[PDB]
Structures are given as C-alpha cells and as structure tokens.
Design a protein around this nucleic acid. Structure first.
Length: 94
RNA sequence: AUUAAGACAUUCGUGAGUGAUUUAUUUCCAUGAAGUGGCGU
C-alpha cells in the first residue's frame, strides 16, 4: 500500500491450506534483513478499544522515532538533534 | 463424250451435373498508484 515503509500494510499468514502456520516473526526478520530492532510499546490497560488507542500510539511513535533520525523534534521545550546530522559530524569528513 | 454426270462429312447435342474457403489457434505475456515530508533548533 501507500507509505508501506512506515508499517501501513502489515499482513501475516494464519492458515495454509487449513493448517495453522507457526512462523516465529523474530527469526524470520533476522534471516532476511541486515539489522532488526524491537520497540516495547506501552502495554496500557483498557485493551478493548484495540483499534484506535493502540494504532494512534504506534503511528505517532513511528513518526516520533522517524523524525529523530531524519531531521529532529522541535515542539514545546523539547529538542532532539537529527541523529543523521549527528552521525556525519562524528565521522572524518565532518 | 472420256468405266461418265449429279452429291457440303452432314443432322440432332448447354462443359454440364454434386461441392460451405472451411478446420485448428485465449490480444495475451512482464509491470507496486507509488515516492518524499518541510519549518518553527
């Protein structure tokens, strides 16, 4: 789908020809990708509004986390420097 | 006046009768409606 790289079209397989699939997500990502990181989302209670409350946190966090590596955060009195910018200052070409 | 004289190889007669330019053949193969955030430090 559109903007798929930010996690908008995630699907998983449940039944293959009426057989329950047991595929560990961690090692499946390990073999296919060079680097894999896991983020612990806040296991807030009232997990009955599964759709909106969880989705809003996850995508706000992704926008938060992605707009840390690329550019920075500039809102209220809270500033995180661009990690990409910090990365290139550290190295030799500066 | 001489084995001679006269005598259309002619009459009638449809190149016609039966016959499907038809049978077989995928306008199909490949292809992300996707990409990116920016400024207010």
């Amino acid at each position: 789908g559109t903007r798929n790289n930010k996690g908008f079209g995630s699907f998983t397989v449940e039944y293959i020809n009426n057989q329950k699939n047991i595929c560990n997500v961690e090692d499946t990502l390990k073999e296919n990708f060079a680097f894999v990181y896991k983020k612990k989302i806040a296991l807030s209670r009232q997990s009955t509004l599964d759709f909106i409350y969880i989705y809003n946190q996850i995508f706000s966090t992704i926008k938060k986390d992605y707009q840390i590596l690329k550019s920075g955060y500039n809102f209220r009195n809270e500033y995180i420097k661009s990690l990409l910018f910090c990365y290139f200052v550290s190295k030799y070409p500066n």
